[PDB]
PDB file of all heavy atoms in Angstrom:
ATOM      1  N   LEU A 375      -9.781 -24.013  14.430  1.00 62.49           N
ATOM      2  CA  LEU A 375     -11.033 -24.689  14.003  1.00 62.49           C
ATOM      3  C   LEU A 375     -10.730 -25.554  12.775  1.00 62.49           C
ATOM      4  O   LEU A 375     -11.217 -26.698  12.724  1.00 62.49           O
ATOM      5  CB  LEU A 375     -12.109 -23.635  13.704  1.00 62.49           C
ATOM      6  CG  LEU A 375     -13.511 -24.186  13.476  1.00 62.49           C
ATOM      7  CD1 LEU A 375     -13.881 -25.189  14.567  1.00 62.49           C
ATOM      8  CD2 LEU A 375     -14.532 -23.066  13.432  1.00 62.49           C
ATOM      9  N   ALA A 376      -9.927 -25.037  11.836  1.00 65.26           N
ATOM     10  CA  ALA A 376      -9.530 -25.833  10.661  1.00 65.26           C
ATOM     11  C   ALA A 376      -8.793 -27.085  11.148  1.00 65.26           C
ATOM     12  O   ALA A 376      -9.109 -28.185  10.657  1.00 65.26           O
ATOM     13  CB  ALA A 376      -8.663 -25.013   9.739  1.00 65.26           C
ATOM     14  N   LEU A 377      -7.854 -26.918  12.075  1.00 61.65           N
ATOM     15  CA  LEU A 377      -7.099 -28.076  12.629  1.00 61.65           C
ATOM     16  C   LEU A 377      -8.089 -29.159  13.066  1.00 61.65           C
ATOM     17  O   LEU A 377      -7.929 -30.308  12.624  1.00 61.65           O
ATOM     18  CB  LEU A 377      -6.232 -27.605  13.800  1.00 61.65           C
ATOM     19  CG  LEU A 377      -5.043 -26.720  13.429  1.00 61.65           C
ATOM     20  CD1 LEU A 377      -4.123 -26.520  14.622  1.00 61.65           C
ATOM     21  CD2 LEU A 377      -4.276 -27.307  12.254  1.00 61.65           C
ATOM     22  N   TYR A 378      -9.067 -28.799  13.906  1.00 66.03           N
ATOM     23  CA  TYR A 378     -10.013 -29.793  14.395  1.00 66.03           C
ATOM     24  C   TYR A 378     -10.788 -30.436  13.250  1.00 66.03           C
ATOM     25  O   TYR A 378     -11.022 -31.651  13.258  1.00 66.03           O
ATOM     26  CB  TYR A 378     -10.981 -29.180  15.402  1.00 66.03           C
ATOM     27  CG  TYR A 378     -11.854 -30.231  16.048  1.00 66.03           C
ATOM     28  CD1 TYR A 378     -11.439 -30.910  17.187  1.00 66.03           C
ATOM     29  CD2 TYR A 378     -13.098 -30.552  15.514  1.00 66.03           C
ATOM     30  CE1 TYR A 378     -12.231 -31.876  17.777  1.00 66.03           C
ATOM     31  CE2 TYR A 378     -13.900 -31.510  16.101  1.00 66.03           C
ATOM     32  CZ  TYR A 378     -13.460 -32.173  17.227  1.00 66.03           C
ATOM     33  OH  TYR A 378     -14.251 -33.129  17.817  1.00 66.03           O
ATOM     34  N   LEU A 379     -11.187 -29.621  12.268  1.00 62.70           N
ATOM     35  CA  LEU A 379     -11.899 -30.169  11.085  1.00 62.70           C
ATOM     36  C   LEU A 379     -10.947 -31.111  10.335  1.00 62.70           C
ATOM     37  O   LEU A 379     -11.379 -32.227   9.988  1.00 62.70           O
ATOM     38  CB  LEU A 379     -12.340 -29.013  10.182  1.00 62.70           C
ATOM     39  CG  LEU A 379     -13.443 -28.125  10.760  1.00 62.70           C
ATOM     40  CD1 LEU A 379     -14.022 -27.207   9.692  1.00 62.70           C
ATOM     41  CD2 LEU A 379     -14.546 -28.968  11.391  1.00 62.70           C
ATOM     42  N   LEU A 380      -9.702 -30.674  10.126  1.00 61.25           N
ATOM     43  CA  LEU A 380      -8.686 -31.539   9.454  1.00 61.25           C
ATOM     44  C   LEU A 380      -8.488 -32.803  10.295  1.00 61.25           C
ATOM     45  O   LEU A 380      -8.395 -33.894   9.707  1.00 61.25           O
ATOM     46  CB  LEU A 380      -7.377 -30.757   9.347  1.00 61.25           C
ATOM     47  CG  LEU A 380      -7.361 -29.648   8.300  1.00 61.25           C
ATOM     48  CD1 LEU A 380      -6.201 -28.696   8.535  1.00 61.25           C
ATOM     49  CD2 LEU A 380      -7.321 -30.228   6.903  1.00 61.25           C
ATOM     50  N   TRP A 381      -8.408 -32.647  11.621  1.00 58.86           N
ATOM     51  CA  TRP A 381      -8.151 -33.810  12.505  1.00 58.86           C
ATOM     52  C   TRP A 381      -9.272 -34.844  12.336  1.00 58.86           C
ATOM     53  O   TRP A 381      -8.954 -35.995  11.994  1.00 58.86           O
ATOM     54  CB  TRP A 381      -7.997 -33.366  13.965  1.00 58.86           C
ATOM     55  CG  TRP A 381      -7.086 -34.243  14.765  1.00 58.86           C
ATOM     56  CD1 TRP A 381      -5.836 -33.929  15.223  1.00 58.86           C
ATOM     57  CD2 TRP A 381      -7.356 -35.579  15.237  1.00 58.86           C
ATOM     58  NE1 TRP A 381      -5.310 -34.976  15.928  1.00 58.86           N
ATOM     59  CE2 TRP A 381      -6.215 -36.001  15.957  1.00 58.86           C
ATOM     60  CE3 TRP A 381      -8.441 -36.455  15.120  1.00 58.86           C
ATOM     61  CZ2 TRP A 381      -6.138 -37.261  16.552  1.00 58.86           C
ATOM     62  CZ3 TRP A 381      -8.359 -37.699  15.706  1.00 58.86           C
ATOM     63  CH2 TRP A 381      -7.225 -38.093  16.408  1.00 58.86           C
ATOM     64  N   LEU A 382     -10.530 -34.443  12.538  1.00 63.16           N
ATOM     65  CA  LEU A 382     -11.599 -35.437  12.469  1.00 63.16           C
ATOM     66  C   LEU A 382     -11.680 -36.038  11.078  1.00 63.16           C
ATOM     67  O   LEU A 382     -12.152 -37.170  10.918  1.00 63.16           O
ATOM     68  CB  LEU A 382     -12.930 -34.827  12.899  1.00 63.16           C
ATOM     69  CG  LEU A 382     -13.697 -33.832  12.019  1.00 63.16           C
ATOM     70  CD1 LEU A 382     -14.586 -34.530  11.008  1.00 63.16           C
ATOM     71  CD2 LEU A 382     -14.527 -32.916  12.900  1.00 63.16           C
ATOM     72  N   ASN A 383     -11.229 -35.300  10.058  1.00 64.73           N
ATOM     73  CA  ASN A 383     -11.145 -35.872   8.716  1.00 64.73           C
ATOM     74  C   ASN A 383     -10.026 -36.908   8.623  1.00 64.73           C
ATOM     75  O   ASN A 383     -10.225 -38.002   8.080  1.00 64.73           O
ATOM     76  CB  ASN A 383     -10.933 -34.765   7.691  1.00 64.73           C
ATOM     77  CG  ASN A 383     -12.042 -34.698   6.667  1.00 64.73           C
ATOM     78  OD1 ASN A 383     -12.868 -35.608   6.572  1.00 64.73           O
ATOM     79  ND2 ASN A 383     -12.070 -33.625   5.896  1.00 64.73           N
ATOM     80  N   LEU A 384      -8.844 -36.582   9.144  1.00 71.16           N
ATOM     81  CA  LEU A 384      -7.669 -37.410   8.892  1.00 71.16           C
ATOM     82  C   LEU A 384      -7.204 -38.184  10.118  1.00 71.16           C
ATOM     83  O   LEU A 384      -6.948 -39.391  10.026  1.00 71.16           O
ATOM     84  CB  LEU A 384      -6.526 -36.540   8.362  1.00 71.16           C
ATOM     85  CG  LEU A 384      -6.410 -36.402   6.844  1.00 71.16           C
ATOM     86  CD1 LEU A 384      -7.742 -36.089   6.196  1.00 71.16           C
ATOM     87  CD2 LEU A 384      -5.402 -35.341   6.485  1.00 71.16           C
ATOM     88  N   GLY A 385      -7.085 -37.530  11.271  1.00 73.59           N
ATOM     89  CA  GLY A 385      -6.657 -38.201  12.477  1.00 73.59           C
ATOM     90  C   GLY A 385      -5.343 -37.678  13.015  1.00 73.59           C
ATOM     91  O   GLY A 385      -4.995 -36.502  12.856  1.00 73.59           O
ATOM     92  N   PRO A 386      -4.576 -38.554  13.674  1.00 73.60           N
ATOM     93  CA  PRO A 386      -3.309 -38.115  14.283  1.00 73.60           C
ATOM     94  C   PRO A 386      -2.321 -37.535  13.289  1.00 73.60           C
ATOM     95  O   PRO A 386      -1.496 -36.694  13.672  1.00 73.60           O
ATOM     96  CB  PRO A 386      -2.768 -39.402  14.921  1.00 73.60           C
ATOM     97  CG  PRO A 386      -3.980 -40.234  15.167  1.00 73.60           C
ATOM     98  CD  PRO A 386      -4.917 -39.940  14.026  1.00 73.60           C
ATOM     99  N   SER A 387      -2.382 -37.945  12.017  1.00 73.08           N
ATOM    100  CA  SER A 387      -1.455 -37.448  11.018  1.00 73.08           C
ATOM    101  C   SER A 387      -1.487 -35.936  10.875  1.00 73.08           C
ATOM    102  O   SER A 387      -0.593 -35.359  10.250  1.00 73.08           O
ATOM    103  CB  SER A 387      -1.757 -38.091   9.662  1.00 73.08           C
ATOM    104  OG  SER A 387      -0.819 -37.679   8.683  1.00 73.08           O
ATOM    105  N   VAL A 388      -2.496 -35.282  11.449  1.00 72.30           N
ATOM    106  CA  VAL A 388      -2.570 -33.826  11.410  1.00 72.30           C
ATOM    107  C   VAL A 388      -1.421 -33.213  12.197  1.00 72.30           C
ATOM    108  O   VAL A 388      -0.835 -32.206  11.775  1.00 72.30           O
ATOM    109  CB  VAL A 388      -3.934 -33.353  11.938  1.00 72.30           C
ATOM    110  CG1 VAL A 388      -3.925 -31.861  12.202  1.00 72.30           C
ATOM    111  CG2 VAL A 388      -5.011 -33.739  10.958  1.00 72.30           C
ATOM    112  N   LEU A 389      -1.069 -33.813  13.335  1.00 72.25           N
ATOM    113  CA  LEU A 389      -0.024 -33.240  14.176  1.00 72.25           C
ATOM    114  C   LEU A 389       1.297 -33.140  13.429  1.00 72.25           C
ATOM    115  O   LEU A 389       1.968 -32.105  13.470  1.00 72.25           O
ATOM    116  CB  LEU A 389       0.147 -34.080  15.449  1.00 72.25           C
ATOM    117  CG  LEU A 389      -1.016 -34.012  16.440  1.00 72.25           C
ATOM    118  CD1 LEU A 389      -0.779 -34.952  17.608  1.00 72.25           C
ATOM    119  CD2 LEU A 389      -1.223 -32.584  16.917  1.00 72.25           C
TER     120      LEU A 389
END
Side-chain angles (χ1 to χ4, degrees):
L375 190 48
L377 290 190
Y378 187 87
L379 291 192
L380 287 164
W381 210 109
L382 72 86
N383 240 348
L384 268 48
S387 183
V388 167
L389 291 176

